[PDB]
Symmetry: C2
Subunit: 170 residues, 2 copies
């Protein structure tokens, strides 16, 4: 049941990896990761990975005022995060055209891909015991996470792909 | 031999890996890559990997390039950066070049390497060199490392990539102005 959430992530990563497979060198692989040069990569990330990751973070989230995956990304910005992660959070939090918690979380995922910190950020969620207790019910994926080991392995391949996704791609 | 140049890289990577290995989790490893929290990473990179890669890029470099001020000026690894520069690479180049008032060409090249480590664009940048046949002919001898790196099984390029691969699991956050 929790592995179901992992499946959606895995299916998305394999599509993204397959997207880059069209390139025969690193320069061409970088072209395929740039949302201005290859909009299809932005489309893929926003419609497959972002929703899968959103559902994962939303799972077992204590509903309340309303808490969202964006709320999680907020309480994550630390003694439990890094300077670069906090810098990305701030950049995304100040993206004026974005008008919802969902759009902000999506843009945060775009930023993690660009900075190759996706695994890092999810790893950091597991280190904050206070956050997990504060934000999640006991039946939540991150309360039960092993699942965390598996999640991080699924996310790894994306860290060696060079992305240049416009944070305002939505 | 080009193998010696590669050995200095390999030895650099070993030390950097050991530095990060003090940490047990991903978040702690990230703190070991932040030069503000762990300045030893900055000192290590600048005194091990930076000179190693400087030597690799300088190998077989034709000593001069033409210019319209003084007819010609000395070529350097920094000159190779200038000639070669993705959107990610261009932003980094502009960054290093802006905050480069009276810095050595060596210092600016070192700074670019810091930036490549931060963005995990080391492999991509070296690939940019190899794919630019004009740049290689213009700037290097046929016996220069990056000119030669196009060929063999495994190539010099392949060896270089494999030596650098352990770094790809690490997260760096180095102040470009650390030196």
């Amino acid at each position: 049941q929790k592995k179901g959430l992992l499946i959606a992530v895995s299916v998305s990563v394999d599509k993204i990896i397959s997207h880059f497979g069209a390139a025969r060198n690193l320069v061409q692989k970088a072209q395929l990761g740039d949302s201005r040069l290859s909009p299809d990569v932005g489309h893929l990330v926003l419609t497959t990975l972002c929703p899968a990751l959103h559902a994962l973070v939303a799972d077992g989230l204590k509903p309340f005022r309303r808490s969202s995956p964006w709320s999680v990304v907020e309480a994550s910005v630390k003694g439990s995060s890094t300077r670069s992660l906090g810098t990305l959070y701030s950049q995304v939090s100040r993206l004026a055209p974005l008008s919802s918690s969902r759009s902000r979380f999506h843009a945060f995922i775009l930023g993690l891909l660009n900075t190759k910190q996706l695994e890092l950020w999810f790893s950091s969620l597991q280190e904050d015991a206070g956050l997990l207790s504060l934000m999640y019910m006991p039946t939540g994926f991150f309360s039960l996470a092993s699942l965390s080991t598996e999640l991080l392995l699924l996310l790894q391949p994306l860290s060696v792909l060079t992305f240049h996704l416009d944070l305002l791609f939505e």
